[PDB]
Amino acid sequence: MSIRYESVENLLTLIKDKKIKPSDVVKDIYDAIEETDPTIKSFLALDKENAIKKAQELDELQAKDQMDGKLFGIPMGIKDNIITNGLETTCASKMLEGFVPIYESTVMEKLHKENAVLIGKLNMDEFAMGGSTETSYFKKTVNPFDHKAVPGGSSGGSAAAVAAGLVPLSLGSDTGGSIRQPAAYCGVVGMKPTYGRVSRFGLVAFASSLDQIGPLTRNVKDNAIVLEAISGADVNDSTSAPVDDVDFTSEIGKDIKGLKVALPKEYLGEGVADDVKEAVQNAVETLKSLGAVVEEVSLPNTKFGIPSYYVIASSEASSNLSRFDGIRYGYHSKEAHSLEELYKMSRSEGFGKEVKRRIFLGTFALSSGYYDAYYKKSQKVRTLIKNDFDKVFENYDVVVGPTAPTTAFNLGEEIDDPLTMYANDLLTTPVNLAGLPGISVPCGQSNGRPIGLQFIGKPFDEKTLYRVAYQYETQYNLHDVYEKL
Amino acid sequence: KVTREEVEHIANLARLQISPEETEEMANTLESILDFAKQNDSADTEGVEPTYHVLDLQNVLREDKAIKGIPQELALKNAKETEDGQFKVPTI
Amino acid sequence: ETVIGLEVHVELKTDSKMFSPSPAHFGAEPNSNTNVIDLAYPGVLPVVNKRAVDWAMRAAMALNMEIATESKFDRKNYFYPDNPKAYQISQFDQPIGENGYIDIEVDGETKRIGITRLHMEEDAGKSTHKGEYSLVDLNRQGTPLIEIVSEPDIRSPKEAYAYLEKLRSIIQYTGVSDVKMEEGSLRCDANISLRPYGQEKFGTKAELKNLNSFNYVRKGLEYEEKRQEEELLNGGEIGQETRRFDESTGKTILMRVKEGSDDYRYFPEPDIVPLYIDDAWKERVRQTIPELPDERKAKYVNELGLPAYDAHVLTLTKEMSDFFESTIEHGADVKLTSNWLMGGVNEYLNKNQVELLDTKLTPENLAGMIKLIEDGTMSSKIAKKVFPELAAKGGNAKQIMEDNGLVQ
Numbered sequence: 001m002s003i004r005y006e007s008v009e010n011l012l013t014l015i016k017d018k019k020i021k022p023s024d025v026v027k028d029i030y031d032a033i034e035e036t037d038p039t040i041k042s043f044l045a046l047d048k049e050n051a052i053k054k055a056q057e058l059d060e061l062q063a064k065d066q067m068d069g070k071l072f073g074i075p076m077g078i079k080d081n082i083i084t085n086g087l088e089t090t091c092a093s094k095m096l097e098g099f100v101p102i103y104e105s106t107v108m109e110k111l112h113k114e115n116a117v118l119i120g121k122l123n124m125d126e127f128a129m130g131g132s133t134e135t136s137y138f139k140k141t142v143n144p145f146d147h148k149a150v151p152g153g154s155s156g157g158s159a160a161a162v163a164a165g166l167v168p169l170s171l172g173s174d175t176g177g178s179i180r181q182p183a184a185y186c187g188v189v190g191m192k193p194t195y196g197r198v199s200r201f202g203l204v205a206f207a208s209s210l211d212q213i214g215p216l217t218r219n220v221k222d223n224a225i226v227l228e229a230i231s232g233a234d235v236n237d238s239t240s241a242p243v244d245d246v247d248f249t250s251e252i253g254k255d256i257k258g259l260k261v262a263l264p265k266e267y268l269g270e271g272v273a274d275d276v277k278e279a280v281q282n283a284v285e286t287l288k289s290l291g292a293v294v295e296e297v298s299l300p301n302t303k304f305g306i307p308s309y310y311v312i313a314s315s316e317a318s319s320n321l322s323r324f325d326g327i328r329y330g331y332h333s334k335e336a337h338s339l340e341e342l343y344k345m346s347r348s349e350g351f352g353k354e355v356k357r358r359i360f361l362g363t364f365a366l367s368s369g370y371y372d373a374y375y376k377k378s379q380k381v382r383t384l385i386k387n388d389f390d391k392v393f394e395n396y397d398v399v400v401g402p403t404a405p406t407t408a409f410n411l412g413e414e415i416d417d418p419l420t421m422y423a424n425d426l427l428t429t430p431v432n433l434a435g436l437p438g439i440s441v442p443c444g445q446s447n448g449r450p451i452g453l454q455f456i457g458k459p460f461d462e463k464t465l466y467r468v469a470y471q472y473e474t475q476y477n478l479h480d481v482y483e484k485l
Numbered sequence: 486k487v488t489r490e491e492v493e494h495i496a497n498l499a500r501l502q503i504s505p506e507e508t509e510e511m512a513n514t515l516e517s518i519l520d521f522a523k524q525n526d527s528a529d530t531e532g533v534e535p536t537y538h539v540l541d542l543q544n545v546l547r548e549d550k551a552i553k554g555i556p557q558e559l560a561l562k563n564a565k566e567t568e569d570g571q572f573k574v575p576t577i
Numbered sequence: 578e579t580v581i582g583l584e585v586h587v588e589l590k591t592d593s594k595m596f597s598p599s600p601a602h603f604g605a606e607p608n609s610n611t612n613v614i615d616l617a618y619p620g621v622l623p624v625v626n627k628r629a630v631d632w633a634m635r636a637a638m639a640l641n642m643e644i645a646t647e648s649k650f651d652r653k654n655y656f657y658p659d660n661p662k663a664y665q666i667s668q669f670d671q672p673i674g675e676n677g678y679i680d681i682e683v684d685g686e687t688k689r690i691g692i693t694r695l696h697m698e699e700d701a702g703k704s705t706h707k708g709e710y711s712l713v714d715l716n717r718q719g720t721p722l723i724e725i726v727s728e729p730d731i732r733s734p735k736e737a738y739a740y741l742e743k744l745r746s747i748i749q750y751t752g753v754s755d756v757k758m759e760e761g762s763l764r765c766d767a768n769i770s771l772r773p774y775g776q777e778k779f780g781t782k783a784e785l786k787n788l789n790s791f792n793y794v795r796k797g798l799e800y801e802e803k804r805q806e807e808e809l810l811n812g813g814e815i816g817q818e819t820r821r822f823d824e825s826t827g828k829t830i831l832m833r834v835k836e837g838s839d840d841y842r843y844f845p846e847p848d849i850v851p852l853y854i855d856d857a858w859k860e861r862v863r864q865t866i867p868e869l870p871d872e873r874k875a876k877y878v879n880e881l882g883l884p885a886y887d888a889h890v891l892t893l894t895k896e897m898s899d900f901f902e903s904t905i906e907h908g909a910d911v912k913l914t915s916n917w918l919m920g921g922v923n924e925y926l927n928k929n930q931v932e933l934l935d936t937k938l939t940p941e942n943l944a945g946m947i948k949l950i951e952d953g954t955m956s957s958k959i960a961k962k963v964f965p966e967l968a969a970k971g972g973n974a975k976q977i978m979e980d981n982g983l984v985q
């Protein structure tokens with residue numbers, strides 16, 4: 001619980017310079033969790049036994065000076081959304097409680113090859129549906145900056161674990177903003193890379209055309225390091241992009257003089273709180289002092305992000321969650337006699353309330369007579385939303401704005417009011433809709449709760465995003481705050 | 486609108502058990518949400534093509550090379566009801 | 578007028594499954610031929626079979642269909658134990674093949690049966706209804722299938738039988754499937770509606786199921802449903818909609834009272850990138866279609882001077898047709914070759930359950946035996962004793978009536 005606040009970059013040099021051994025590292029990580037997570041509640045299944053075993057292997061490799069891997073000895077937490085072979089993966093649902101995968105997801109395969117150490121699975125909204133992680137069937141993760149505030153969702157555990165110094169790196173998933181929004185609320189860095197940048201094989205599906213795995217870290221550099229490790233074409237995922245260049249750090253450090261940054265007027269609309277709005281405006285000035293050209297633009301179809309996103313994602317979800325029937329795995333109802341009952345009871349009992357809402361919405365949107373007016377219509381709106389970005393990207397290198405309309409809200413404050421919960425996705429969904437990469441870094445605090453600054457880039461231009469985010473991070477960050485909590 | 490009938494129709498389509506009470510609750514939610522969805526009417530989509538895939542990527546195919554399946558044991562591992570190396574389900 | 582339309586499914590002889598690397602050929606042990614993709618495990622993804630696509634377009638072209646340039650897959654949503662994903666990956670809006678046609682002979686006339694589409698999809702698993710429960714085996718789940726839906730141009734169970742007989746033959750020649758209803762690699766569903774000549778022709782429909790074999794059932798289905806369709810025309814029946822066929826009793830038991838019409842909520846499969854079938858691709862595949870039966874029979878009769886009956890028998894399978902064409906171009910007499918193929922050789926394949934290609938005779942040795950006959954150095958008698966062995970292990974015939982004691 002001593003290197004527990006060290007960055008990935010620095011923790012690696014310590015291990016390489018033999019200032020500490022992989023086993024001591026792992027010991028520190030678990031002392032932290034046992035001492036801190038009973039309050040934060042960011043982890044679900046822990047993999048301590050296996051973690052120590054792996055750490056032993058690494059000590060030997062350290063001694064024999066054969067420390068290979070971009071993340072040798074580095075601890076990692078993974079959203080229980082991402083399949084981990086042999087380790088319970090629940091998507092924080094009763095439906096998958098006790099589920100032990102018999103295969104490995106591509107990101108884990110890649111992370112294990114880089115010699116990172118699996119510490120455990122992180123809490124999330126059930127089946128990744130939510131914005132506060134409160135729908136979790138197991139426990140309610142809390143915000144490290146204020147234990148009464150939500151950590152965001154659906155990757156609340158991923159952001160909280162990193163913000164509370166339990167691991168220097170975590171993996172989350174982002175379908176409508178589930179990496180960026182939690183990163184914003186918990187004051188950390190979260191990148192949802194370009195759709196197609198990271199394999200979806202092994203990612204329990206929410207919305208296939210929108211889902212994307214990404215890293216959360218306490219700083220920009222580490223984040224780029226984790227991304228390089230998980231990106232890449234994958235034969236197991238036909239939609240993974242055949243883009244060879246996965247170098248995201250080579251541009252980190254270079255200035256942004258003349259960088260053309262677009263500030264969409266809609267990203268500072270009426271739905272955006274004054275403190276958030278004020279914080280992003282100051283951030284804009286910080287960008288100008290670094291030499292960037294920040295100018296206002298328009299992304300006219302912004303207002304349609306939430307509605308179309310919810311129709312499309314629920315529709316896809318209504319089909320992607322249909323495999324859960326309790327017949328081959330997961331929750332199987334007992335008091336079921338009829339086949340119709342096996343399906344209906346296993347699903348109504350295994351799925352939480354929000355999941356069922358999404359399924360009802362999606363099933364309806366795709367049903368006869370409603371298909372064109374809802375689903376197809378929303379698919380057309382998605383085109384418009386993507387068009388907004390292409391027009392803006394003809395003259396600007398990057399887009400900036402707030403990550404979320406507000407700071408983290410309270411536990412219990414919006415969990416019983418869906419439309420209010422959804423509104424928090426105002427500034428994140430357009431990015432998934434357009435298939436673009438988006439990163440969030442902290443740019444201030446209000447009442448102690450962090451505010452996120454979002455940088456949206458061109459497809460496969462995460463390097464530029466990391467370049468501008470780092471520059472901004474030199475001017476303002478929360479690196480020295482996490483340790484205080 | 487959103488009637489108890491539609492709600493029940495949807496319930497059956499998504500294979501979800503819905504009680505004669507959660508129906509009136511799912512109805513209000515389904516109405517509130519769908520109404521909230523009608524904001525898209527303001528979106529000028531006339532003549533615009535729908536987006537099915539955000540990433541232009543063509544013909545990603547797999548060579549027809551078979552890979553032996555996993556042991557029957559593995560295939561049944563996570564299932565609750567199994568018999569004769571097969572999944573056991575009611576007969577309807 | 579009796580308007581019928583057939584709905585056929587063909588199993589592709591690929592090595593692996595449609596959207597999974599699993600073997601398309603399984604053993605007897607249930608759930609022994611699966612992987613996490615066939616088991617619809619959470620997080621898995623489909624990976625399309627390259628060969629299945631080529632074969633699908635090959636069959637489509639052999640059926641003279643217009644091939645799509647842009648073609649994607651769609652999810653056909655529906656719950657059922659043999660469909661683990663709760664959806665079959667198929668093709669809705671952009672089938673790989675459209676508007677083809679097949680010509681057949683009926684009452685001495687040439688009738689053209691249009692074919693609406695040929696699309697790709699995957700097969701379901703099998704549920705053995707046994708006891709108070711059903712046991713599900715997913716070894717077959719995911720196997721490649723192409724659905725071939727005929728236009729409603731056939732007018733009688735006579736033509737319909739001829740339709741699927743021509744169809745079966747053409748697909749067998751493409752090499753993409755064995756298409757044997759007996760083995761399941763070929764299936765068919767009918768759609769019949771009666772109504773007086775000169776109408777909107779809307780005599781409703783009659784999606785009847787359980788048709789299991791050409792000569793068999795489906796060949797007698799129509800005899801019955803029209804029958805009923807007519808005897809019930811003196812009332813204007815509830816039209817009825819879908820009825821199963823009872824074998825022995827043999828007739829349409831109007832099985833289910835529709836709920837309305839199953840909503841599959843079809844939508845483009847986001848997990849599979851669209852196919853863009855370029856001209857070079859089409860041509861490449863187009864070039865793999867061999868010479869079809871009709872063309873070959875015409876030549877055999879008009880060019881080789883073979884009897885029409887012989888031409889028909891010899892082209893029932895591409896393999897025998899090829900063997901015949903090679904054997905003769907090897908010097909052997911045309912008629913004698915036809916006789917040995919239709920006779921001795923065929924007798925062999927039957928009383929031995931073996932494909933002509935698995936045996937050991939070759940167009941060369943057979944041509945060699947045929948020459949030893951039309952020369953006289955071997956009587957039809959010795960020929961009957963030599964052929965058997967020549968088939969199994971042979972190589973030289975004027976070496977067996979030697980390596981044996983049956984000489985010239």
Ligand SMILES: NC(=O)CC[C@H](N)C(=O)O
Binds near residue numbers: 154176178
């Ligand atoms: N999974 C995340 O990307 C969440 C998206 C959105 N907040 C929801 O509940 O769908």
Ligand SMILES: [Mg+2]
Binds near residue numbers: 586698724
């Ligand atoms: Mg079909």
